[PDB]
Design an enzyme around this catalytic site. Sequence first.
Site, short mmCIF file in Angstrom:
data_model
loop_
_atom_site.label_atom_id
_atom_site.label_comp_id
_atom_site.label_asym_id
_atom_site.label_seq_id
_atom_site.Cartn_x
_atom_site.Cartn_y
_atom_site.Cartn_z
CD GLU C 18 -5.53 -6.25 -1.55
OE1 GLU C 18 -6.03 -5.29 -2.17
OE2 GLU C 18 -5.15 -7.22 -0.84
CG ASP C 19 1.21 -2.55 -2.81
OD1 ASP C 19 1.18 -3.22 -1.09
OD2 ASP C 19 1.16 -3.01 -3.53
CB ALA C 20 -3.72 1.76 -1.52
N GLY C 158 3.01 2.31 -4.25
CA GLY C 158 1.48 2.49 -3.75
C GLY C 158 0.59 3.71 -4.62
#
Lengths: 55, 243, 338, 98, 48, 17, 50, 49, 67, 101, 335
Positions: C18-20, C158
Amino acid sequence: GGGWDNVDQTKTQCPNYDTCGGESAYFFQLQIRSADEPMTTFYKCVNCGHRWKEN
Amino acid sequence: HYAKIRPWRTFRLNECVCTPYNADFDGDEMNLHVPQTEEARAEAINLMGVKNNLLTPKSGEPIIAATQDFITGSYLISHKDSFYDRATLTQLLSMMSDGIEHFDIPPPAIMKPYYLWTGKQVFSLLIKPNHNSPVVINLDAKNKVFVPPKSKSLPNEMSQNDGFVIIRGSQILSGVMDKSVLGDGKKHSVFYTILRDYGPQEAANAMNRMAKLCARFLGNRGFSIGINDVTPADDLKQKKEEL
Amino acid sequence: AGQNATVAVMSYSGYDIEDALVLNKSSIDRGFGRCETRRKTTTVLKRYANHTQDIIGGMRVDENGDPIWQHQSLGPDGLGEVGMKVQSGQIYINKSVPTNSTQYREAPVIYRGPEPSHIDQVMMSVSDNDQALIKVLLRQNRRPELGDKFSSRHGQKGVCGIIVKQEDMPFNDQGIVPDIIMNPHGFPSRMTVGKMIELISGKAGVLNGTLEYGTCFGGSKLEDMSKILVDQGFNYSGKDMLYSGITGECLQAYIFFGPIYYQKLKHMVLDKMHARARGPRAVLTRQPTEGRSRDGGLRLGEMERDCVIAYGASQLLLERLMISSDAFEVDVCDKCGL
Amino acid sequence: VKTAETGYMSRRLMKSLEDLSCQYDNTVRTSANGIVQFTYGGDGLDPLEMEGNAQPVNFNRSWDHAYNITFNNQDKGLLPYAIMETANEILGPLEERL
Amino acid sequence: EVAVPDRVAKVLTYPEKVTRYNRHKLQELIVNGPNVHPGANYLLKRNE
Amino acid sequence: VSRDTWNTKNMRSLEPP
Amino acid sequence: XXXXXXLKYICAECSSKLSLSRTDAVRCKDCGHRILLKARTKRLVQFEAR
Amino acid sequence: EIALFKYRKARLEPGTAIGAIGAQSIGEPGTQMTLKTFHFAGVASMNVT
Amino acid sequence: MIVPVRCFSCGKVVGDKWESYLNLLQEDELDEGTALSRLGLKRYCCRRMILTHVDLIEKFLRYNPLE
Amino acid sequence: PDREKIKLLTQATSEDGTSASFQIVEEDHTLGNALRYVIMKNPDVEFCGYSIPHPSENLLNIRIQTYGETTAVDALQKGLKDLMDLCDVVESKFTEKIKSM
Amino acid sequence: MSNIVGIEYNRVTNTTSTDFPGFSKDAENEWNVEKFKKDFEVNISSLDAREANFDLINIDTSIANAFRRIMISEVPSVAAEYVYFFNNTSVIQDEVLAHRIGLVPLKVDPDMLTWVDSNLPDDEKFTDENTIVLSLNVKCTRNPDAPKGSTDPKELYNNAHVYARDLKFEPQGRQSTTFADCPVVPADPDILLAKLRPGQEISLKAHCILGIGGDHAKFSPVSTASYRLLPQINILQPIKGESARRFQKCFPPGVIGIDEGSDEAYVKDARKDTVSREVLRYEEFADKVKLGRVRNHFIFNVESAGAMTPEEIFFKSVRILKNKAEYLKNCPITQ
Ligand SMILES: [Mg+2]
Ligand SMILES: [Mg+2]
Ligand SMILES: [Zn+2]
Ligand SMILES: [Zn+2]
Ligand SMILES: [Zn+2]
Ligand SMILES: [Zn+2]
């Protein structure tokens, strides 16, 4: 009547596959999220008419 | 949740529990509240606890489940081409646990010429690591991409792809580890079945095992996207132009 | 505004969902993403009707001759010494305000910062109305840390999910190691083919010694960049074979490897981390203040009240909304409800 | 536009159903002890606890799970009528309880 | 679980009452004090 | 090159701090 | 053995060394500039070389 | 045994904030749907909101 | 501002090659690619460290306040 | 006598040995993977594998399971000694080649 | 398969060792020296004062990667850690200058310093066995004899560019004698530390201590320490005439050669080969070539930052692995 012949289909099996074996589903894509989330795709089974959104 | 004191300056959470929050680590900020009384603290951890709220009350379908990379890693492990020797399998199980779980290694799926375990055996051990664990799961599910078997008379697990999941006695017999089997919104999920049959603690243990395994496995296995995955074939160009 | 990070597009460590992002430690050590913030504080020594005005004297010492800690970086002039560090609680402008605005009450400017700054510019000047003007610039170096936001010119933002050692990072044949690892799951749904073409064009450009062009409706053709890549010994599609940094084995999939321009965004976790236990309260309502600079509390709105009700947690409602916000022991008469 | 427009809708719905709770006699009542539903959903069943398609029990998965849990290759399969006698011996006391 | 920063763990406190079961633990926390994380920020005496 | 340095030199830096 | 450790004003435009006595002025004495900057401190400033 | 146990466990528990749960179960899906009615391109059916 | 001492990815010293690269560009002119290859910058990370650097310190020194 | 370096995790240890989790502080994938390889080259070991529970802790849990012949502690000691011998051989070959050239 | 890593057009196969007892019914490949001692080979391709290329043959991926990781992050080196600014009037911030000085590699050999103990007071922590002191005193003055239109700051001003060489070793006590033959100097003296204009001065001294690359990258002694599996190219069927030239253009120029008279294509040097799988995208050599990589043949390339020789770095790495194994073996297991 109905003009569903003119609507974009796609190869997706509906969640209600056990009741109706539908391999196709009418779709249209909308971006109903912020511009950093991807687009949202709404579906409608050609075999039952059950609508769902796969995002 | 249960607090866990860590050195950095962020609130960290398991990606499995991002869905109920609708969070996506893109700069999202979340508020943490510390209850101050014993009754409020007990009520919080007993009624609003993560383990007690794996299902949304609007429909009862599971809402805490595998996210993207966990689903991809599970699919790549359970993929029918995945074979692991004893050393690789035991390293996979140690990463799946913290190295502090006993595993009863089952007989390999292939016994000649080599002792090879399939990834479905790896996930069967993920569900039920040893004989002391009570989680015996029996499940029939359809993966989201399920091409039907070659004949109408043939049963559903004879699908040309691994599109139908059969679990008997916590032993995965067919099918890949899909989103329909490990993700949210499906009442035939592995974690939904473990929950409903053996408790939120068993379901959470399976979820943690899966999360740790995927996190430690995808990086070493390698999974990437590039321009060649979106480049059309040369025949496709001509076909598209004429069409 | 940015840097050309060596990017491997792969799933890694599980901290990139998730965009991390995964950030290379030892790239951060060598200065990747290293920024700084400069903040100014302005004060005016205003003259008053009673032939009186503020002064900036100070720097009292202890019995051993050294200044007190609160004035450790203050200078005789009473304005922070240029180049010295200020921690939380110290003074960099020792202003005093008259008590009859002869006797001056202390109104110094105190540094309230979780991390120390450094005075790098004290400007002593006068406004257009013969009024003394003091400006102090506080500079603060900032290492990229967990939760800092980065973006890559294609809407793919992110935060840093994890910072890992260089040896744990995957490497190629030449030992090139990524500064940033970004999830492949961000590509298919966002449909940022421009980012892949940018990676390939940047790789071909660094290998060819020329900056490339990604102009709209134009730019460097993909076939030319692939030709450059093949001529220098790389795959045409920018997918190199890497080895795992933690197992040493070949990765079973070829990894999209190359430079991508990454921008560090102004939203740092150091300015967002806020926590309050007890402190300042509104005078009128006796509830926690509503600002991070004022040590404010986090509002539990009608929506959160509704959620807690739906849980059926009456005692948690009572504790969050009465005990921990505004609890008053009132006297109520039983005869008159007053 | 949806954000605020839908935000009040949810709050408004809550304001109407804020004090509706299942009682100990299995009735849904307002805070004034007035009956809204004599049984929740005409079923008394929690939507959070339904394993089937809006039904409490998934019969197929339950049967498969029971057969696997109790499986023993050394066990005499009941005759088709005897299965019915076992079923009517377990269910039927519960049936005449009502 | 949620991973909480030690920096905010050193401000966000729980007001634990001293019993016969946790007195040694709370003594250790008090000795640790407000600057070392497994510590305590405030003490409220019974008669105060 | 092609000469040993570890045999002659006591590796003090390799002790644990 | 071991090892131990280790009011001038500046005109903005003329870069002149200034010494502002007790309540004298805020102007530069060499030109009419009204902007003065404190010079760097004379004492030690220590940094981690990281 | 399993079926009876599941049916018994499926019963709504007394004290449940069932009204609040229903309000949120009807309202949370209401924040994800557009106020503008979006239709499949080609239906040409009546524009019912 | 100024050329970084090491490449961000490898750690190879590139801060001692900025002036040599500039002199290769100006005196006895070369292409940027062959000038980078002449200095020993084989890896594309070390190549980009020099190719994409913007020497902003020479522009900041035009505002030196203690002339 | 360093008693805080390697610990036997008693909760994850079987009866009569043959299964044990060892927690080794200040170690990481470097020692973990080499030790796992060497221990897996032991014919009595049926299960070897390490995990770093969290990147924020300098910690390493290594799980050894054997058959009934030897114990997990015996297998771990044997693997450590065999890694020592491996490094001896590598050192000798490298020194010989560096001298020769 | 069988010890060769399969290089395909879409995937890599056979990346795991499979050389342990329990892989098959024949419980072979159980550990024993005098078998590893006989199989293992070292081939030193080149040795320089800063670069070493050598081959570790018939060693496991885990052991080779342990060596590589120790070289990168566990072999100690000396770098500046604390910079004490007496005066920094330049345009570069002190923290930035300190970072750059720390990133400067010093040509000081370790094992001639002792590890700093942090359990002691600052006034007793830094000793002569513990720290290297390097001073930097540079002051920019306009060159009065600057040539007409000499924009170049080198002729326009004196000391307008600070270099790593400007850092001077300050011998402390024994250091005066121990480092007499080897005064601590920057390995790279042309590093542009800073650029100053007239009136700007930089006055500092730095305390340089032993450190670990895993702690900060400035302490890493290798510009890059890495290996690659030896490429293997198998020509299954003869390729000749002009398809042979097309085959030769799919590899780096000196990889495969053209035979004379035979006219067939043959593998001339697989070591020179970067595995780009350029031949695997052409559907005419699909049945004629097989790309692979020897899984246990490692081509180590060690480039030192300048403090030590790469061979010494590699030996220190193998010794570090052995020493941690020995320390763990000697440690008693606590319950
Ligand atoms: Mg977002
Ligand atoms: Mg977000
Ligand atoms: Zn359907
Ligand atoms: Zn009254
Ligand atoms: Zn002036
Ligand atoms: Zn580099």
